[PDB]
Amino acid sequence: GSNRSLIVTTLLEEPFVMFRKSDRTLYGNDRFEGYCIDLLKELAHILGFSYEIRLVEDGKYGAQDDKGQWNGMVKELIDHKADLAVAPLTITHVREKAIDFSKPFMTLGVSILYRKGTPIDSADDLAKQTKIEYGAVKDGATMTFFKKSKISTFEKMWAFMSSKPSALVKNNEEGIQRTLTADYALLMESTTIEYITQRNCNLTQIGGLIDSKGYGIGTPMGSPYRDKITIAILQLQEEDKLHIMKEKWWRGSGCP
Ligand SMILES: C[C@H](C[C@H](N)C(=O)[O-])C(=O)O
Ligand SMILES: [Cl-]
Ligand SMILES: [Zn+2]
Ligand SMILES: [Zn+2]
């Protein structure tokens, strides 16, 4: 064991982690802002560590291939290339077999992003039909949810998605654009839907939450920092700081 700064793996995703806008050019950690950047700053202060933020090269959250090999931030942790993954990283039972998670700092569920004014009201309506395309981000928790479901409705939807080489999108930005340009609904985590629908009055959430889960800080399996981060998250919750941080970055814009 050594004393050194922690390496934090992450990726770009609004409003969690973004390149802050400046016209003096910025280096290192100073390049970044967002809810997860604030959370990291608070966790580092409480626990007393310095750190360096590195974007994950493949830009992916993490999913397993047919051989069982991981990619994205999960793989960085597995390979011990980072000490912490600080991102909107969904805690899943499958991922827990490969990495460790703090307790959640945010909770959420899968829901549906679609246009307003349609008669679609639930995931069942989407599995019912064919005119409206639907999908999710590739190599993500939401995709894995459908690929692994044993509920008929979601097995059907996975068959649909999986077979269309367009429905599984590279990231949230491309999914949002598809919703804006084609007859397409995005399966998407509810926190990000809240973020988008507060800023785009022509989009809405369709239905409620299809499941319930949390975002946690990821560590390599067995890391001593996992329980420390958990304790610090509980302190930030008790101090009201996770509340302030959410409302800081989910500020919202006027939608009549
Ligand atoms: C984009 C998002 C990624 C998700 N937060 C994950 O950790 O895999 C999703 O899958 O819906
Ligand atoms: Cl980087
Ligand atoms: Zn290690
Ligand atoms: Zn409040």
Author numbering: 1 to 256
Sentences from the paper on this structure:
Interestingly, GluK3 residue D759 from one protomer faces D730 from other protomer on LBD dimer formation.
Ionotropic glutamate receptors (iGluRs) mediate the majority of fast excitatory neurotransmission at the chemical synapses in the central nervous system (CNS). AMPA, KA, and NMDA receptors form tetrameric cation conductive channels that are activated by presynaptically released glutamate resulting in an influx of sodium and calcium ions leading to membrane depolarization. KA receptors are abundantly expressed in hippocampus and cerebellum; display characteristic slow kinetics, are mainly involved in long-term memory formation and motor control. They are divided into two families consisting of the “low-affinity” glutamate binding subunits (GluK1-GluK3) that form functional homomeric ion channels and “high-affinity” subunits (GluK4 and GluK5) that form functional receptors only on assembly with “low-affinity” subunits. In order to understand the conformational changes underlying GluK3 functions in the context of full-length tetrameric receptors and to explore the role of N-glycans in modulating their functions, we expressed and purified rat GluK3 receptors from baculovirus-infected HEK293 GnTI− cells; trapped them in agonist and antagonist bound states and determined their structures via single particle cryo-electron microscopy.
